[PDB]
């Protein structure tokens, strides 16, 4: 048992809710919140901009030191950093950005990072401003992640479409 509330169960291990991931994280304080990161960990907008804003920019300060030491992430890759006031840890995962021409095939590699964590609160990777089809992202998530994932979908119309179209 865990403290996630109000989720619809899609599969043995995947759950989904219409929720603002920032407010969800603040309430639950999960062990792991996933960020929709880019390779430079520049949290400007989308999920990343919202999560970083909620940390009063501490996520960005930490991220800038990480990049100065380690260089950029790979598309499809990840790193574990602090969750600040939102979670124990933040798993920054880079899904492909279709609006940059990045290979959508890398979405499966991106979701594979979730399997290193027993339980996660997450957005749909490559959705939103990353330009991929969220229905596809949900399918890849269900077919790739084997650990317990709680998906927060900000947009109510999209959430309803994802549920109603789920196979
Ligand atoms: O709901 C959906 C459908 C997919 C889309 C998405 C876009 C970018 C990254 C990851 C997912 N997206 N966005 C969010 N999903 C969950 N919590 C969110 N908090 C936010 C706060 C904001 F200022 C802006 C957006 C969100 C947001």
UniProtKB/Swiss-Prot annotation:
Membrane-topology annotation of the record: Multi-pass membrane protein
Activity regulation: Inhibited in vitro by GRL-0617.
Effect of residue 31 to A: In strain: Mu/B.1.621
Catalytic activity: Thiol-dependent hydrolysis of ester, thioester, amide, peptide and isopeptide bonds formed by the C-terminal Gly of ubiquitin (a 76-residue protein attached to proteins as an intracellular targeting signal)
Subcellular compartments: Host endoplasmic reticulum membrane
Chain ranges of the Macro domain: 1-167
Protein's job: Responsible for the cleavages located at the N-terminus of the replicase polyprotein. Participates together with nsp4 in the assembly of virally-induced cytoplasmic double-membrane vesicles necessary for viral replication. Antagonizes innate immune induction of type I interferon by blocking the phosphorylation, dimerization and subsequent nuclear translocation of host IRF3. Also prevents host NF-kappa-B signaling. In addition, PL-PRO possesses a deubiquitinating/deISGylating activity and processes both 'Lys-48'- and 'Lys-63'-linked polyubiquitin chains from cellular substrates.
Subunit text: May form homohexamers. Interacts with N protein.
Protein name: Papain-like protease nsp3
Provenance organism: Severe acute respiratory syndrome coronavirus 2
Residues represented out of the complete protein: 1025 to 1191 of 7096
């Amino acid at each position: 048992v865990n403290s996630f509330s109000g989720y619809l169960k899609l599969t043995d291990n995947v759950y989904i809710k219409n929720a603002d991931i920032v407010e969800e994280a603040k309430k639950v304080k999960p062990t792991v919140v996933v960020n929709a990161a880019n390779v430079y960990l520049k949290h400007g907008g989308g999920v990343a901009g919202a999560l970083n804003k909620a940390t009063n920019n501490a996520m960005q300060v930490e991220s800038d030191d990480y990049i100065a030491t380690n260089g950029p992430l790979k598309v499809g890759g990840s790193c574990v950093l602090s969750g600040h006031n939102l979670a124990k840890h933040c798993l920054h995962v880079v899904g492909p950005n279709v609006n940059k021409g990045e290979d959508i095939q890398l979405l499966k590699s991106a979701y594979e990072n979730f399997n290193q964590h027993e339980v996660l609160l997450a957005p749909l990777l490559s959705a939103g401003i990353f330009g991929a089809d969220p229905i596809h992202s949900l399918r890849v998530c269900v077919d790739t992640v084997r650990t317990n994932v709680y998906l927060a979908v900000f947009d109510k119309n999209l959430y309803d479409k994802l549920v109603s179209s789920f196979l």
